[PDB]
Write a structure and sequence with these properties.
By secondary structure, the chain is mostly beta strands. It has one domain (about 1-180). The protein contains three helices and ten strands. The strands form two sheets. A six-stranded mixed sheet has the order 1-2-6-3-10-9. Strands 5-4-7-8 form a four-stranded antiparallel sheet, with no helix packed on it. β1 and β2 (about 15) form a beta hairpin. The longest helix is centred in the middle third of the chain and has 9 residues, at about 90-100. It comes from Oreochromis niloticus. This is Centrosomal protein 120.
Length: about 180
């Protein structure tokens, strides 16, 4: 059988592994912290000034559709750092194995029903460093590049440096009783 995160609807947590053996509570969280150079993902300066331009981040976390607080200033992002968390009932070994087997988290920058770009954040990398969950939280954090869904990326003017659209993301796994700190 495949390891699956099974929503327990009444209680508001996901069971991973057999419920009689995997009984500890964990929190898995995603924080979108800041962004820069997002204007490269919009082909026209004119769309930046339309007020229908309202942008947000989307991702699926263990099957949960998550959207962030909409913001308007793409050139100078104004959104607040925002965390989404899910509760998991599991065991340390089974949850670490489950996470090591998950595909990367794909975080999208959206406008309306359009994805302007996405970036991959490895949950398996987080599992790989989740080696002291009895005592410490484990966190992968960095500046992740947002890639447009186009075949060809055009850059005008072409410079020696290449500042790309970037999203600061932190993904954290911890025992529920272990403070993020």
């Amino acid at each position: 059988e495949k390891l699956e995160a099974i929503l327990i609807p009444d209680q508001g947590y996901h069971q991973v592994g057999p419920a009689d053996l995997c009984t500890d509570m964990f929190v898995l969280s995603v924080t979108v912290a800041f962004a820069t150079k997002l204007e490269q993902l919009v082909p026209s300066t004119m769309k930046l000034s339309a007020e229908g331009s309202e942008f947000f981040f989307y991702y699926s976390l263990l099957g949960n559709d998550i959207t962030s607080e909409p913001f308007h200033n793409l050139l100078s992002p104004d959104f607040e750092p925002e965390r989404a968390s899910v509760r998991i009932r599991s065991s340390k070994q089974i949850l670490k194995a489950f996470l090591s087997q998950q595909p990367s988290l794909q975080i999208h920058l959206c406008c309306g029903n359009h994805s302007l770009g996405s970036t991959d954040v490895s949950l398996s990398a987080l599992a790989g460093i989740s080696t002291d969950l009895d005592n410490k939280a484990a966190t992968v954090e960095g500046a992740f590049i947002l890639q447009p869904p186009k075949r060809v990326k055009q850059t005008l003017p072409a410079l020696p440096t290449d500042l790309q659209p970037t999203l600061g993301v932190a993904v954290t796994l911890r025992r529920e009783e272990v403070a993020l700190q």
